[PDB]
Amino acid sequence: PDPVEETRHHAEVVGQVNELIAAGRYGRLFAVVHFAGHQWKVTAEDLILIENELDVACGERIRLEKVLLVGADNFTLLGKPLLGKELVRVEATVIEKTESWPKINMKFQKRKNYQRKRITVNPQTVLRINSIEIAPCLC
Amino acid sequence: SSFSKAPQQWATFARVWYLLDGKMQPPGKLAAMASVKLQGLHKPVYHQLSDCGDHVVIMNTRHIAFSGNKWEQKVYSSH
Amino acid sequence: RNRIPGRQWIGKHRRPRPVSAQAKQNMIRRLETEAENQYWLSRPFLTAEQERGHAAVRRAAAFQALKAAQAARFPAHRRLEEQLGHLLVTRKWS
Amino acid sequence: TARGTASRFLTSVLHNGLGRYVQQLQRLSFSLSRDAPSSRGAREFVEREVTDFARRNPGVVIYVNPRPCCVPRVVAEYLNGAVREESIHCKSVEEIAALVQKLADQSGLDVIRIRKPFHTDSPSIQGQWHPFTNKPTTLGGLRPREVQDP
Amino acid sequence: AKKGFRAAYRFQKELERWRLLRCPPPPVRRSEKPNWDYHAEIQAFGHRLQETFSLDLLKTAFVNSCYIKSEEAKRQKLGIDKEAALLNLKDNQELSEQGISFSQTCLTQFFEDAFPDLPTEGVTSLVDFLTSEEVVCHVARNLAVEQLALSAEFPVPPPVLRQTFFAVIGALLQSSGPERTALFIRDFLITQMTGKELFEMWTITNPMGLLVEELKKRKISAPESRLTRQSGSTTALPVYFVGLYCDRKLIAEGPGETVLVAEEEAARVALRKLFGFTENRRPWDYSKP
Amino acid sequence: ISRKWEKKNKIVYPPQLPGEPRRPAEIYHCRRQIKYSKDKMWYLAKLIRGMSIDQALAQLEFSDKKGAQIIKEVLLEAQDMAVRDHNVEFRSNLYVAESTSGRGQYLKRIRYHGRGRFGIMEKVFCHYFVKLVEGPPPPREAPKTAVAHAREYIQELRNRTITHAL
Amino acid sequence: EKDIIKMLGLEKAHTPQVHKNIPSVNAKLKVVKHLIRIKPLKLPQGLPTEEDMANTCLKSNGELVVRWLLN
Amino acid sequence: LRSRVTDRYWRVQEVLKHARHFRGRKNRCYRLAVRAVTRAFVKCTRARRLKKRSLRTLWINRITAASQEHGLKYPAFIINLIKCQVELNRKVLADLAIYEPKTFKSLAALAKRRREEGFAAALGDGKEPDGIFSRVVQHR
Amino acid sequence: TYSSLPDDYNCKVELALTSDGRTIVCYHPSVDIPYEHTKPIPRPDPVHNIEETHDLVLKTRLEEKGEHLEQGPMIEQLSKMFFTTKHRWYPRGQYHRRRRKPNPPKDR
Amino acid sequence: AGSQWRLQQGFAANPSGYGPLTELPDWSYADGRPAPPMKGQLRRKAQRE
Ligand SMILES: [K+]
Ligand SMILES: [Mg+2]
Ligand SMILES: [Mg+2]
Ligand SMILES: [Mg+2]
Ligand SMILES: [Mg+2]
Ligand SMILES: [Mg+2]
């Protein structure tokens, strides 16, 4: 399509979605958030297990801003490569700061009498994602 | 989809029958797409442990067209 | 039915393994990189005479620091707290 | 190995942290000795850190029972009913504080292999894939080689 | 005979383990175990839930009529007079009635405000499920309400345990404001429906019949069932998709093993969409009011 | 040696409250140091599992094994204990709940071959254990029908979930 | 060739290292010119000062940006 | 002073507790158990390394399966999505494929539109202004 | 009306780009199966098979006749019914039966 | 993949290289006060300096 008409059509779609998000006509929201080096597909009232220790006390409420993707039943917003902090707000609550089950790492070589056994206990953190909100500000 | 738990699982893992005509079609190109459907490599829910798999019905298999001189050169051997 | 005599990669008779189209491209990609490597080395900023001892104080200081650190190797101090701290083994609640 | 031990899914007890956060640790009981040299770490922890620890965590009840023993122990009970035995035998003061702090942050569920690093209820937003979610519909729902009734 | 004592004693630790496995001990209350101090637990109970309780109210809530009757039999058995103190111990019968009446009223207010389309029968099923036996007993047991409950025959019977849990609600109602107790209900009783779906808590047997009645209220004539998609009609595992069309407009679609099963599932989806109880619905708000 | 089967008859249960189901009787009996072999005695023991005492004696009446007579004596003397020592009426109302054979103490001898060689000979002794329970014999399980196989297979296909899903 | 790599600070692969363009360094690079990638260092904003030492970042194309992600 | 090992019962119990589920005489005899237990741990670590590879391979098959359903191959779906500066790993794309059929169509629709713009530039003189979706936005 | 993919099966995807350039939006509503593309419900398919009256003088008989075929003919009947092989319908030994977990973990 | 395209546009070959997806803090407190810096980010700003 001609870019002159393409830009004009894009304005209508953005306005239509902006009208839809401003009236609160969206249902459940899901978001793809980058956290601790991994990308999680996260919706409200979920749990995620973080493999690295965090310096957050239990019960604290934290906010995540690396939201790659957000969408609902009738619309979906893509980032390049991130969504602005003023558009989508995601909050999570720390629940458990625990240690992983004993994992075994052993190396063995034939007929050379070489055995190495070590047990790894990786500290872990469990997060509860409470709410995902979308602001109605969208150019 | 707001389906109940039982009918939701049944719909996702449903078996689907496909029809594939063979009128002047090489068996290799006929088998390439037929192998995918049998395994279930077309479902995004694929997994080898699961029993996902679709029936395939191939008709007009007498009219296949081997490319080149494979009608006289290719041999099938058994003991 | 047809065997490769002896080991299949050593000796007078080997495997006829040919070069592939992928292998040719890998050679060319490395050749193009090395062609650029020998161009940036062609024209130095300074000549051989202009670099005669331009950075020698730093080289001398670097060696002197190495001598100083290696000459400090000596047993560490021994204090009374280490010896008297062993008596805390039998500390009791009275 | 994973095939030898049991497994469980990532679960939070009583849907904790959704409406409000409740410290799942319930009580601790210290079994130390007043004369045993191996109980020195326990005794130093009680004099200094126990009083401050109780203030920070008002939801736990701390019991100290100095009795003749050789291996000091600390027993932690959680709300769901799990009791975890621990040994503080011959440890430094800061090691006891780290060990007790770790017991305060644990949910109390059994420490075994967790099959998935996430948990979700109703993940099928905007529908879940079924083999009919991307196939176009034919006029009249006719089969590929079906003859029309009229 | 090997010299030593560590080997001899360490095996006694193993012998006890085998005996327990072969003959498991009957469950006993936490009170009879060596570490127990009742007043300390009560104070910690209030701080754990971040609520302010009255110590007189809680101790009144944790004593059941079963315990009082059990005590009196012991007093008569020993022939020791304690009627002045034992008989003058208020039970939790009054508190439980206050808690149950308030909990049903508070839960109904939440659902009517959040789900305007739920009928009177539907909302009654929702509140009854959250205040049912299995849901409340599970919450009470995991909240250390069963550990502090004074009653005989441990483990506490489910009817008794539910009585004690709502007694705590009654104690909280008189200590803090009614709005504070409402948050307590939201945090520990509304959260029990997370993940669960309607018609798993409100069981009905004629979805098609109920759908037509609801459409009459909404002024829609009648649904019409049409077979949308199918895959295999002679196989032992057929798949059918029955869709409901009113005035030639699709409103629901459901799969199933057979047409009769799929058609009912189509009505289930229609009812879930009409009553505003789908799976895409806005998640329940838990933020501070 | 170990003797625990004999002591199982000394267990005294607490009295039953009225309205509870009637407790079926349990009689434990055994014989020690039988000259018959362990493996040979097992086939006879496997024969009479799950059958009532009257038909169990009938089958062992005509068996040609040397252990058939030994087992029949054990059942007959165990039946007398059930009707006299215990309050088990209807001496025909017993079924063999469990029967098995254990190994006893062996005697080692020398068996000669020739060329000055020898082999160690093991005199074989075995034990017999039988438990009789009052009541009609339980009904033997029939093979799974066609519908049962179909029900399990359809149920198996319905338990499937998306592996490594989210 | 191993020693020349070691004495040029190129022990770890895929880690950029800056060297002068004097003939003394170029003499060693010519020996191992088939094991390394050489690109010029570009300075769009010039040499960093003592104030902007901590904000420097080296892009892939071979330029050093003095001010990286301001504010 | 004759020193004898008395805790030998616990010496062999630490080994047999990991071999309780084996088949044959490896779950009872200690000599046969240690060789089985030692090989059990070695296979545990090597499979742990392969666990990441296998799951990555599984995701690509699901992405390819869900991309072919829209008529777009996997190689075209990935490179033409990166050109839109959408940094989604293969883990979440597989999850979007199964539980988000609508959204995965938009990503597939986005990739096809981006791909059709790349071909137009090559077909032209190369002086065509970058496509409305092909414009590069640099954050700095 | 421009779309890289047809709007006939899953949804009517409509892509757009924000004027700022940092966000890509897309309005993707569902598409519903039209009435003309569906066939009427085959309700009375086993109309007479389900409810058959043997006679009008005697009460109907629920006599489910059975053959109880041997293990041989039974397996080959089921395998042809479910389009599987015959090797998985045989039972297994006590060793495999006992090692199955009585209470497998359950999610959701 | 497509690392050749990213190098052409000036970005890193690996999306984890000095991009906006890595430098920025991944979490912060709800009230708004900044979170403590990452161990990795501090180390990466020491070799650059
Ligand atoms: K050779
Ligand atoms: Mg050879
Ligand atoms: Mg060769
Ligand atoms: Mg002789
Ligand atoms: Mg021998
Ligand atoms: Mg022998």
| Amino acid in position B21 | D
**Residues near I16 by beta carbon (within 8 Å), at least 6 away in sequence:** A9, A10, A13, A14, A17, I24, I25, I26, I27
Q: Which among B3, B16, B39, B43 is the top mutation candidate for probing chain H, defined by the most H β-carbons within 10 Å of its own β-carbon?
A: B43
G13 phi, psi to nearest 5 deg: -75, 155
Distances (CA, A) of F7 to F4, F15, F105: 5, 20, 20
Q: B41: which chain H residues are within 8 Å (Cβ-Cβ)? A: 61, 64-65
- In chain A, where does DSSP find H-type helix? 3-22
Distances (CA, A) of I41 to D141, E242, F120: 12, 8, 83
Report yes or no on E171 lying in a domain: yes
Measured between CA atoms, how close is A9 to chain I, in angstroms? 8
State the DSSP code for C77. P
| Amino acid in position H70 | H
- For D57-85, b where at least 16 C-beta lie within 10 A, e where not — what string? bebbbbbeebeebeebebbbbbbbebeee
Paired with C24 in beta bridges are none
Give the count of beta carbons closer than 10 Å to the beta carbon of residue F30.
18
Contact at 8 Å (CB) between H83 and H111?
no
What distance in Å separates the CA atoms of residue E223 and residue E273, rounded to the nearest whole number? Answer: 14
Instruction: Establish whether F122 is an annotated binding residue.
Output: yes
Give the count of beta carbons closer than 10 Å to the beta carbon of residue E44.
20
**Residues near E65 by beta carbon (within 8 Å), at least 6 away in sequence:** E91, E93
Q: Crossing angle of helices F146-158/I71-82, nearest 10°?
A: 40
What distance in Å separates the CA atoms of residue F8 and residue E1, rounded to the nearest whole number? Answer: 33
3-state SS, D75-98, equals EEEECCCCEEEEECCCCCHHHHHH
Helix (H) or strand (E) holding E129: helix E120-130
Q: In what order do the strands lie in the sheet with E239-245?
A: E250-256, E239-245, E224-231, I39-40
Distances (CA, A) of G2 to G15, G28, G32: 17, 12, 9
Closest listed ligand to the CA of F108: 6
Distances (CA, A) of E220 to A32, D76, E122, E224: 41, 62, 21, 12
**Which residues 102-141 on chain D approach chain F with CB closer than 8 angstroms?**
116, 118, 120, 123
Q: D34: which chain C residues are within 8 Å (Cβ-Cβ)? A: 92-93
Does the beta carbon of F109 lie under 8 angstroms from any beta carbon of chain I?
A: no
- For E207-216, b where at least 16 C-beta lie within 10 A, e where not — what string? bbebbeebbe
**Residues near F27 by beta carbon (within 8 Å), at least 6 away in sequence:** F9, F78, F81, F82, F86, F88, F94, F131, F132, F133
What distance in Å separates the CA atoms of residue D46 and residue D93, rounded to the nearest whole number? Answer: 9
Interface contact D105-A40, CB threshold 8 A: no
Report yes or no on E144 lying in a domain: yes
Q: A117: which chain H residues are within 8 Å (Cβ-Cβ)? A: 41
Residue showing tokens 């790659």: A68
Resolution of the PDB structure in angstroms: 3.5
| Integer Rg of chain I from CA | 28
What distance in Å separates the CA atoms of residue A68 and residue A77, rounded to the nearest whole number? Answer: 9
Contact at 8 Å (CB) between E250 and E257?
no
Q: What separation in Å is there between the alpha carbon of C8 and the centre of ligand 2? A: 7
Q: Which domains are delineated in chain F?
A: 1-166 (3.90.470.10)
Tally of residues, chain C = 94
Do E71 and E195 fall within a single domain? yes
Residue showing tokens 């190994």: F103
Do E64 and E173 fall within a single domain? yes
What distance in Å separates the CA atoms of residue E180 and residue D20, rounded to the nearest whole number? Answer: 13
The count of domains in chain E is: 2
Domain limits for position H74: 1-140
What distance in Å separates the CA atoms of residue E168 and residue E189, rounded to the nearest whole number? Answer: 13
Does the beta carbon of E279 lie under 8 angstroms from any beta carbon of chain A?
A: yes
Dihedral of CA G46/G48/G54/G58: which sign?
positive
- For F75-103, b where at least 16 C-beta lie within 10 A, e where not — what string? beebbeebeeeeebeeeebbbbbebebbe
Helix, strand or coil for residue B57? Answer: strand
Token duo for residue D130: 């079924």
Residue showing tokens 């894939």: D129
State the DSSP code for F7. G
What distance in Å separates the CA atoms of residue J49 and residue J47, rounded to the nearest whole number? Answer: 5
Give the count of beta carbons closer than 10 Å to the beta carbon of residue B54.
18
**CA nearest neighbour of H102 among B54, G3, A75:** A75
- For chain H, which chains pass the contact test of at least 3 CB pairs under 8 Å? A, B, D, E, F, I, J
For residue G16, the number of C-alpha atoms closer than 13 Å in the C-beta half-sphere is 17
D136 phi, psi to nearest 5 deg: -65, 150
Q: F151: which chain E residues are within 8 Å (Cβ-Cβ)? A: none
Query: How many CB pairs below 8 Å do chains B and E form together?
Result: 45
Interface contact B46-H69, CB threshold 8 A: no
**CA nearest neighbour of H71 among A6, B20, I3, B34:** I3
Domain limits for position E259: 206-280
Paired with A98 in beta bridges are A124
Contact at 8 Å (CB) between E148 and D26?
no
Q: How far apart are the first and last CA of chain I?
A: 42
Helix, strand or coil for residue H136? Answer: coil
Nearest to A27 among E194, E280, E286 (CB): E280
Do E156 and E268 fall within a single domain? no
**Residues near E192 by beta carbon (within 8 Å), at least 6 away in sequence:** D15, E130, E135, E138, E139
Do E243 and E142 fall within a single domain? no
3-state SS, H77-128, equals HHHHHHCCCCCCCHHHHHHHHHHCHHHHHHHHHHHHHHHHHHHHHHHCCCCC
Q: Which of E205, E235, E259 is the last residue of a domain?
A: E205
Contact at 8 Å (CB) between D55 and D87?
no
Report yes or no on E55 lying in a domain: yes
Contact at 8 Å (CB) between A31 and A132?
yes
Contact at 8 Å (CB) between A130 and A44?
yes
Helix (H) or strand (E) holding B55: strand B55-59
Do E119 and E232 fall within a single domain? no
Measured between CA atoms, how close is F142 to chain B, in angstroms? 30
Report yes or no on E24 lying in a domain: no
Strand ranges in chain E using DSSP code E only, listed in sequence order: 224-231, 239-245, 250-256
Do E213 and E243 fall within a single domain? yes
Instruction: Establish whether C5 is an annotated binding residue.
Output: yes
What distance in Å separates the CA atoms of residue G26 and residue G41, rounded to the nearest whole number? Answer: 15
**CA nearest neighbour of I108 among E199, D115, E135:** D115
Q: Crossing angle of helices E93-114/E120-130, nearest 10°?
A: 130
What distance in Å separates the CA atoms of residue F128 and residue F34, rounded to the nearest whole number? Answer: 8
Interface contact D66-C93, CB threshold 8 A: yes
What distance in Å separates the CA atoms of residue D23 and residue D59, rounded to the nearest whole number? Answer: 7
Token duo for residue F67: 């252990």
Measured between CA atoms, how close is A89 to chain I, in angstroms? 15
State the DSSP code for D46. I
Helix, strand or coil for residue D70? Answer: coil
Give the count of beta carbons closer than 10 Å to the beta carbon of residue E188.
24
Nearest to E49 among D15, D22, D65 (CB): D22
Report yes or no on E118 lying in a domain: yes
Look at strands D25-31 and D61-64 and give their pairing.
parallel
What distance in Å separates the CA atoms of residue A33 and residue D77, rounded to the nearest whole number? Answer: 35
Q: E6: which chain H residues are within 8 Å (Cβ-Cβ)? A: 6-7
What distance in Å separates the CA atoms of residue H11 and residue H17, rounded to the nearest whole number? Answer: 11
Distances (CA, A) of F24 to A8, A36, F108: 89, 65, 44
What distance in Å separates the CA atoms of residue F97 and residue F81, rounded to the nearest whole number? Answer: 16
What distance in Å separates the CA atoms of residue D30 and residue D67, rounded to the nearest whole number? Answer: 10
What distance in Å separates the CA atoms of residue F49 and residue F67, rounded to the nearest whole number? Answer: 16
**CA nearest neighbour of I23 among A65, E121, B19, A81:** A81
Contact at 8 Å (CB) between A75 and A27?
no
Token duo for residue I5: 């993919």
Token duo for residue E157: 């019977």
Contact at 8 Å (CB) between F102 and F38?
yes
What distance in Å separates the CA atoms of residue J30 and residue A61, rounded to the nearest whole number? Answer: 6
Paired with E254 in beta bridges are E242
Token duo for residue C48: 């051989």
Closest listed ligand to the CA of F123: 6
Measured between CA atoms, how close is I21 to chain A, in angstroms? 8
What distance in Å separates the CA atoms of residue E184 and residue E50, rounded to the nearest whole number? Answer: 10
What distance in Å separates the CA atoms of residue G28 and residue A82, rounded to the nearest whole number? Answer: 44
Q: I36: which chain D residues are within 8 Å (Cβ-Cβ)? A: 139-140
Instruction: Establish whether C43 is an annotated binding residue.
Output: no
Do E198 and E266 fall within a single domain? no
Contact at 8 Å (CB) between E266 and E225?
yes
Do E273 and E146 fall within a single domain? no
**CA nearest neighbour of D125 among H108, H59, B4, A43:** A43
State the DSSP code for E62. T
Report yes or no on E268 lying in a domain: yes
Do E177 and E192 fall within a single domain? yes
DSSP letter string over G13-56? Answer: TT-------SHHHHHHHHHTTTS----PPB-TT-S--SSSGGG-
What distance in Å separates the CA atoms of residue D2 and residue H122, rounded to the nearest whole number? Answer: 54
Q: Are 3 or more Cβ–Cβ pairs between D and A shorter than 8 Å?
A: yes
Helix (H) or strand (E) holding A103: strand A103-109
Instruction: Establish whether C11 is an annotated binding residue.
Output: no
Report yes or no on E138 lying in a domain: yes
Contact at 8 Å (CB) between I14 and I31?
no
State the DSSP code for C90. G
The count of domains in chain H is: 1
* Angle G38-G43-G48 from CA coordinates, rounded to 5°: 120
Distances (CA, A) of I97 to D36, D95, I91, I101, I102: 53, 47, 9, 9, 10
Interface contact A97-D106, CB threshold 8 A: yes
What distance in Å separates the CA atoms of residue E6 and residue C46, rounded to the nearest whole number? Answer: 80
Do E217 and E177 fall within a single domain? no
Q: What separation in Å is there between the alpha carbon of F124 and the centre of ligand 5? A: 15
Distances (CA, A) of I62 to H15, I54, I56: 62, 10, 15
Do E169 and E217 fall within a single domain? no
Q: What separation in Å is there between the alpha carbon of C15 and the centre of ligand 1? A: 8
Helix, strand or coil for residue I72? Answer: helix
Contact at 8 Å (CB) between F31 and F75?
no
Nearest to H83 among J5, J10, J15 (CB): J5
Paired with F127 in beta bridges are F102
Token duo for residue E98: 């206050």
**CA nearest neighbour of H70 among D134, B42, A75:** D134
Helix, strand or coil for residue E90? Answer: coil
Contact at 8 Å (CB) between D102 and D86?
no
What distance in Å separates the CA atoms of residue H58 and residue H95, rounded to the nearest whole number? Answer: 12
| Amino acid in position I92 | R
What distance in Å separates the CA atoms of residue I16 and residue H138, rounded to the nearest whole number? Answer: 19
Residue showing tokens 């008189």: E174
Q: H6: which chain E residues are within 8 Å (Cβ-Cβ)? A: 2, 4, 6-7
Q: Give the dihedral of Cα atoms G40, G45, G47, G50; nearest 10 deg.
A: -140
Token duo for residue C5: 């005599």
Do E169 and E52 fall within a single domain? yes
Helix, strand or coil for residue E42? Answer: helix
Instruction: Write the burial class of residue H67 (CB in 10 Å: 0-12 exposed, 13-18 middle, 19+ buried).
Output: buried
What distance in Å separates the CA atoms of residue A43 and residue A30, rounded to the nearest whole number? Answer: 4
What distance in Å separates the CA atoms of residue F109 and residue F120, rounded to the nearest whole number? Answer: 6
Q: How far apart are the first and last CA of chain J?
A: 30
